[PDB]
């Protein structure tokens, strides 16, 4: 038997209490078909077909005056495809352009597809600048011009939860250029960008591109551009908050996603798939996160990126991630597994303490019983949920 060429991951199990690493009996457990198992017995996983392209759209976004443009917002078209209220799946096609404003989907019975029609994914733009620092009446000013949102219109519920505020700052769970609550939502070929951008300092700025918080969505080919906060997933309901018993799942393939802080955030079963995550440095130097998960305590499923790509600019600076410890029932959960992980990151260093309540970064190394086997409670609230599993590239060592 002639020796395989290939090069192994020099990652090796358990790991250090700095990164800890998955042994291949671990790691069969961290795999999408885990993340996203059914809660009712007699039921299969979610397995989701690629998104599928109709032949007509039912909706065209476009510029004014262009031949099968039916609306000029996207706004305006999902709420055409909502007030059909129906089970059907819709399509909504968006022509190349920039499109300014947010976009808010909300859950209905019936799927919504919103897809580019461009040569690449940078060919429809659909962005806007808002800060969770921000005032709300500016925050109002900016998303609800000539009476975007008013009672009666789809999405109302989403405005109205944020634009009720009277505190100083609206927040990061208002901060989104592109908020869904559909289930079934699937997003391609466009990019979502919070234009915030280096407009602000290195300071917390929340800038949120893309939320979701529906279950069974998929993202495919899209590009979500930002720096603090840039996607955003959660388990929110009708009241816009963080919930304790509802594990939406999501799955983004072929996609790139960028920022510095917690550049992916939030409470939610999601899978990476062939994306590359990139870390900036043209806002802040001093620090960058690309997960911070807000997996419940008692849930098992967090993030999953898998034959993804990680690449960061300064010297050593960026890491892999942060629990985003939101409330006391709150351990984040992440696995990076046979990813490419560049240039650029602290490898000594990987994960960082927790956000908001600083707890200390502890990885479990576990111990070893009866004919040498790696043994740790994978769950266990006294260690962080943060692991890796035969990564690649000079980052992993």
């Avoid at 969770?132 to 009446?137: E, F, L």
């Avoid at 956000?355 to 790696?374: K, L």
Wanted: glycine share 10%; net charge negative; charged share 15%.
């Amino acid at each position: 038997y002639f020796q395989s060429m290939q090069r192994p991951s020099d990652q090796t199990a358990p790991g250090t209490s700095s990164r800890p690493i998955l042994s291949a009996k671990e790691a069969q457990n961290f795999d999408a078909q885990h993340y996203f198992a059914s809660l009712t017995p007699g039921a299969a996983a979610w397995n989701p077909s690629p998104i599928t392209l109709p032949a007509q759209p039912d909706f065209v976004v476009g510029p004014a005056g262009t031949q099968g443009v039916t609306h000029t917002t996207i706004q305006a078209a999902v709420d055409a495809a909502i007030i059909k209220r129906t089970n059907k799946r819709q399509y909504i096609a968006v022509m190349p352009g920039e499109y300014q404003g947010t976009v808010y989907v909300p859950a209905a019975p019936g799927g919504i597809t919103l897809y580019g029609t461009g040569e690449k994914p940078i060919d429809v733009k659909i962005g806007l600048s808002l800060d969770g620092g921000m005032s709300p009446a500016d925050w109002r000013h900016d998303v609800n011009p000539r009476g975007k949102y008013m009672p009666g219109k789809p999405a109302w519920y989403m405005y109205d939860s944020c634009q009720s505020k009277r505190s100083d700052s609206i927040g990061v769970l208002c901060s989104a250029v592109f908020w869904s609550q559909n289930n079934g939502l699937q997003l391609q070929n466009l990019t979502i960008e919070n234009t915030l951008g280096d407009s602000v300092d290195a300071g917390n700025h929340p800038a949120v591109a893309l939320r979701t918080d529906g279950d069974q969505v998929q993202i495919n080919n899209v590009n979500i551009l930002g720096r603090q906060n840039t996607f955003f997933v959660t388990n929110s309901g009708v009241q816009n908050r963080l919930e304790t018993n509802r594990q939406p799942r999501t799955l983004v393939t072929n996609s790139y996603i960028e920022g510095d802080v917690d550049i992916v955030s939030g409470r939610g079963a999601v899978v990476f798939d062939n994306t590359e995550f990139r870390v900036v440095n043209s806002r802040t130097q001093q620090e960058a996160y690309v997960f911070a998960p807000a997996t419940l305590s008692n849930i098992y499923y967090g993030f999953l990126a898998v034959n993804s790509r990680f690449n960061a600019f300064g010297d050593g600076v960026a890491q892999l991630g942060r629990s985003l410890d939101v409330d006391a029932n709150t351990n984040g959960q992440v696995v990076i597994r046979d990813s490419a992980i560049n240039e650029g990151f602290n490898t000594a260093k990987p994960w960082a303490d927790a956000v908001i309540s600083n707890r200390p970064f502890a990885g479990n190394t576990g111990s070893v019983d009866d004919n040498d086997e790696i043994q740790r409670n994978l769950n266990d609230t006294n260690y962080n949920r943060m692991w890796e599993y035969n990564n690649r590239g000079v980052g992993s060592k």
